[PDB]
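## Example record

The block below lists the input lines for one assembly entry, exactly as stored, with component labels intact.
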Amino acid sequence: HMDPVSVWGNTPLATVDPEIHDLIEKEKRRQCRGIELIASENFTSFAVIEALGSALTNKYSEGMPGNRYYGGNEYIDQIENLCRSRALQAFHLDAQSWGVNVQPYSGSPANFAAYTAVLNPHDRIMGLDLPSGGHLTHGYYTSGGKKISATSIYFESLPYKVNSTTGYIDYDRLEEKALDFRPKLIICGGSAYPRDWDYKRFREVADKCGALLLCDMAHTSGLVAAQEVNSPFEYCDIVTTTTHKSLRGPRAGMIFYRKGPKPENAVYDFEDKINFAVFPSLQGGPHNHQIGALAVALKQAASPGFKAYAKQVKANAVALGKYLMGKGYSLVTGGTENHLVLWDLRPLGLTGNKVEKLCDLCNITVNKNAVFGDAPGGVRIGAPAMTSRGLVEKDFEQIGEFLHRAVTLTLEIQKEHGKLLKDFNKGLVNNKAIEDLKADVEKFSALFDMPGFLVSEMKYK
Amino acid sequence: SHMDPVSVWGNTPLATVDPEIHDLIEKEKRRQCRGIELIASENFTSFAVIEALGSALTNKYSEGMPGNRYYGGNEYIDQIENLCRSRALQAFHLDAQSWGVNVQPYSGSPANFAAYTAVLNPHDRIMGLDLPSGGHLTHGYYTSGGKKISATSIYFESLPYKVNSTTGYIDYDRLEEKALDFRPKLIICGGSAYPRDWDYKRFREVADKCGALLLCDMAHTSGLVAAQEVNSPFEYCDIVTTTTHKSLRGPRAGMIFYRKGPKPENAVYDFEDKINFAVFPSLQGGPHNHQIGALAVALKQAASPGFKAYAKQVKANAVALGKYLMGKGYSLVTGGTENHLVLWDLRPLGLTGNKVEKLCDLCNITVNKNAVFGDAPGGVRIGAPAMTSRGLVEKDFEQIGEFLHRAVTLTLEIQKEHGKLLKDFNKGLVNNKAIEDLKADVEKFSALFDMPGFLVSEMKYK
Amino acid sequence: HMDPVSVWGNTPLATVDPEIHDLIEKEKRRQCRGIELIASENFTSFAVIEALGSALTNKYSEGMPGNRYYGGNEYIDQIENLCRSRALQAFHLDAQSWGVNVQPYSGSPANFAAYTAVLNPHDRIMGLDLPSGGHLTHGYYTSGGKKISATSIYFESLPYKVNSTTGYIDYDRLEEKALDFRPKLIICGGSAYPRDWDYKRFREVADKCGALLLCDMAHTSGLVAAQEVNSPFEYCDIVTTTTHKSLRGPRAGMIFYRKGPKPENAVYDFEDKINFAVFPSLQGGPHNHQIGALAVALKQAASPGFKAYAKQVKANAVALGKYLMGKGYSLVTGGTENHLVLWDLRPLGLTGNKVEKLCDLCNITVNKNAVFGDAPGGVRIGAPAMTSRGLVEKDFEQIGEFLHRAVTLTLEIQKEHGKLLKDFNKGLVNNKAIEDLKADVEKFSALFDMPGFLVSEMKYK
Amino acid sequence: SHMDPVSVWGNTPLATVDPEIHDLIEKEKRRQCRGIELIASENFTSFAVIEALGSALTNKYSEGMPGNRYYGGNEYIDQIENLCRSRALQAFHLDAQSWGVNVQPYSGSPANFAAYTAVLNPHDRIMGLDLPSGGHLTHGYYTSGGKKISATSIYFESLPYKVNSTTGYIDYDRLEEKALDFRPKLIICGGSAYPRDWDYKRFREVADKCGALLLCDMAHTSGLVAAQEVNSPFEYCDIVTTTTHKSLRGPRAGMIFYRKGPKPENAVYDFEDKINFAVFPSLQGGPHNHQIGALAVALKQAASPGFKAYAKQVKANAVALGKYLMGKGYSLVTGGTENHLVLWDLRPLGLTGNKVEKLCDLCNITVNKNAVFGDAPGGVRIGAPAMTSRGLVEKDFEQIGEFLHRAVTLTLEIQKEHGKLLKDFNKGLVNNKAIEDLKADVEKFSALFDMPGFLVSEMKYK
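Predicted structure tokens for the full assembly:
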């Protein structure tokens, strides 16, 4: 006999699957009882979560609004059309000049779909080098020639780099490399670059060598929506993005593309190629709950409160970096123009691994990161998540104080036990000074609110 | 200006933050329970799955996998993913020493493409079931004009195999002959609109004869596989991929199963590391951890005795439906079904699937037009999973058969009165009292059954 | 001190390099003291040899007439232009409808240059299967998927086959495969097919699936020039050829291509692509001595004597095959329409290797060859070379008698020593019956003239 | 009709069978000895080479190689090819245990492409000397507009390296940097218009640093390499390819040298089988055995003491020529030469190579325009091999320098009188008594020297 629908299908998670329910409750507590400084993370709204967890997951709607493969899409079409128009509005795009596809499962599929749309297999691509702050999906191969990224497997990638002494993108070397290599596509945007991007200069390079210009704005898209950084839309042909980082939405991807007349009576040709690449070439039915949740996030992204948030994210990153530099610490480029700071630890004789591990033991989550394109010598620290919990400059200065204490302990351990990781680990065991800072972190962390769920009804307090 | 308080933007419910979207979801909830949903690639998943899907797990970015993450804070995500992996093996009765699984694919299409990336080089040869024969886009597709449509046919070299044009069964002899000529590195089995079970043993003999890897995409039947109601692809295939929302009744997600341990030179399987590396770092970023959580929930449900009875009932409902249709004189491809769907050939009626799909759509009966016998699409594909999840049994699917009978009867009457051109046919859809009577009988029939995933008593629109 | 020009540069070979001179003299004797039945071999004229061995080898002339990269080409241009116009005339082509490039080093580079001209890497190609009588450059991969031919390495090949019971090309299976595989290019022509080609049917297939149609006529080009077989030019877009087989010229290649209006006011687009593929994409400076020698061969190919020769080649192959069949032997397709016969030995319980080896010991040169597309079960026998020495039907009937004797001995050895090759070899050692037939072969062979050199002044007699 | 007797079509000499072609060859023979031939990729080979080239060896089709032929009758072809191979190793002082060679490439361009096919997969990365910097098409070439011109850039992925734009020497630091960025699987050295020796040791350090194979195309200097007059590529390269008709003075043919034996894991080199298989069956058919015979002859000549003195003289002549030009105020790229050629930069004169090439061509002085400093071509390339083969020594090349001096002096005068547009420049070439006087002085100078390959006393046209 089948289970009644009420038994299997309407009973809440806490009863159907206590194991998973309990783990989710623990992850909820982890998220609000520490200091989350991963620049690729945020805390989204309950409203987004409610649309994400909804009956929209049940609808399979291959195709797009007005050109579907089956019926019953009267409401899924409206949700997607709303999501698309809200996406153009969030980034201040004229609909006759820009279109957007909101079906990519995530930012990385969005990139590969864009490539598939406008390139043939083995076409040449250039993107920011991983040690310089770029992303895997912009191309990555090892010194041994092992192709790591699919972008480097199915296309021919060549990375460009930051200047090794200033940490800024070396635009002259960019242009020289693009004239030698002749990429069909240049990617800009990155994961760990602490400055704004000169899209105008990327456009001059792309025109000089004949390339398409794509910006992957996954990391700064929220700042782009609030017009707090340079807009890639002013100079790029295509803009891709993940939607959960500084944009504060669900996990999802978008591809924006130029429409209308080119600046021969020529018109852009991207719309149909982009749509076709997403479906039917790469994806099946879109994840409609993601599209609903995204539409919610894009409306929230259009509000004066979100512009104030993006402003605060920048101000918090600046205040944290100033606090660190005021303690003698070295930031790559000596500051920031966006949501993150990149902390160079080689002046301290430390590696990013050591600091990341010790911070993680105090519930301060950062990530080790390569520096000046040259074990990784730094850590990357992001302001979006904690700003979303309402922290302002004074709070980030206190975060800077916790980081200051954390690196001081990391140096105390390295001096007492050794410079090799095997040595360093010896000092983490039952370290009373780590325990103290972990307590101070948790106390501080628990003084702020938390979007996405009510701290008052969580299982673990 | 100042920042919104967290309570305002971050804790306020959807109905207040975004009434527009809230209202559209409420309307979609009503649409899902006011009609008869017969799309074979759709199901209604559980509220428990949905609760895990809509959770703070969305906030955690955990590039890598348990034990080899790129950053910390992963203590609970690792446990959830490990549980998802172990429950995936349990649900399909797999020995952890012989099988591994990766649960990070965003969906079934990325699961396929990551599997290809793992075991093939660009332009390696692939064979899969032809689309007119019931196959899927991600198994390879190019048009008679030579346009490469599927990315699988863009980055690899595909060649389809077909069903026998008279019996509708997979032509295993032509499959073997094509494979020996083309020499694929990878043969794919599994499909979208095939109404019979698969002879994996025979696929394995072909693969071994031509030196190919053998992958099954069980997206459509994976629920029936978990319940051991259809043949197991795992008995013969190197790799098995799946989507998790169709007959498996889970969230939107994908998995890749791969063999491990000794090959039956003392050589052992080499899939595990290649598969994992292809999913990440090669193709994806951080996994969608809320999907992994929701999938872990669905996989525990799929291991329950109730789910096994559900799978039996899906098959029984599809059989009882096909038998009711053939009792009315209708033609099914292969004359029946061994799985969750029936493929109805309308060409003997002088109809196209489009016309039947449109009139059904107007009575809130959702089917999809579909090519038949590999040869405008001349059929409709009808699936049993979703309505079986609302508790319908054989008698209910016979009444569904009667609604389909009435629907196609009206379709013929319209075609006869107005003509075969769609412009003509449309005329018979306007103020049609017999469509209204069917629409009403459908909605009344539909409202007799429960609905998983949300509470009907709380719906905005009843 | 440098050698005087007279010493190193004008002294004849016999004095500069006695080793090589002596070996060439031995090869000359080998060529006229046996029976040469390799269908891919001929004996060219002394006139061709004189142009081949000439000061034309010294001129490097990259480009083509009227569009060269350096000076001094006043006479090389005239030679090449003459070679091209003589090539169109030899095959009865209108210059407004056909062009030809005569720079390919050989037939195989001619094929790859044609492919490069009209295909992109990994485009699909179909050609006659090697076991069915096709050529390596039409595509070849092993059962294990090892890509053997460059055509199968840089493009995607799929072979079509002869009917396994009739030995004729299976045109229905050809069309079905072309509709499944959708090649961009279909190749016709082959190495060991004993019948004419239905180019009209290949054209219907290519049109139905949208492919270009190329004929590689290397083997029958001489018969094509004499209009003794079907002309590929009537239905193919491109025709390639080697120039030394039945055409009786030097070692070289040619690519013919359609010009002018298509049968949208559309015109063919092959000329510039073909020329560019040959140079600068693939070759350097052409081998001008080859082009001079080829022009000589093409004039000879246009003469009534050459038409009589091509007629005689066919009549000799027919007479030889009739003689063999009259002894109970089995030919694939039961006869021939061209220069060769394909002898099926499986009815005798023999392999082609065994017969080839024993014939080679009697100075009868054939080659083992696969049969009905299914160790190779047959031998391929060609009439061009011995016909060029003036042999007619009665002489080829006597060749058939020598072959009859040779296979009889091969069966006597297989019966006395065993069916395995290790066994069979035991019977070749100091076999008096082989010795006798070798003497009869040589006596017969030495009764006929020899083009290319004067038998009367050769070193070895 | 009947067949022509063998005596008529087959034994009659060319002058009777084809008077047209016979006459054109006689005219080309005269052209070759009535002027000054300064094309660096041309030579005059020996009558012995020509005798072997024009022989019955053309008739033998011998697919495969000695010891592994596809059919019989190969007893003497095998011996000739083995001798050609052993003499190829002897001429370049190679130990048969450390080096093998394949002598079947139809020419140097097929030798290169077969080598690539042997050691690379389609689309593997290759680096070679940029064409404006003195490189060759087969080392990779694509235009600023992105059009892939060389097949090497069509089937593989190429990236050129360049000379230093101010010194004209290979920029080894940028080479290393580009190689570490691009990560080629194959780095090519050797070139067409580079006037200095190559630092193979440095190429080897770069190759080792980036994990590349290292191939030298010594087509231009192979004669000087045989005579140990320039650096040996064999000391540092995995593979060495060459054409055989330039400084080596042989027939038109190609060879591929490859390392064998232990790598300096007890691993050994793996090139031999791959190279052979790439030449045949992969890319070519039967070898051109008359070329192999003629090449065996040239390789015995290249091992003679006279050939070593010839190579010394080529270098001395090119030096004496460049010194004479620079003494007249002219500019050479790098200020001199270490090999067989000089690269004359005409941009300081306000001239293009085209104008100088055309006026020289009108005085029966054959040079070729050529790009310079990697930046209309602003130079001419002048080679010493061919005229050195006619016995010219330093004094003769100084007189050639004087003819070039007079030629470019006239070129400037024409440009000054008529203008810089080629339409203008052409006007000064008509009934020019000073061009005639130079043409006459050139032909008179030219007729003082012998000519290899044929007898001047037998020429149709004296």
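The interface with chain A takes residues 123, 125, 142, 144-146, 157, 159-160, 178, 180-183, 185, 210-211 of chain D (CB under 8 Å). The first strand of chain D starts at residue 36 and ends at 37.
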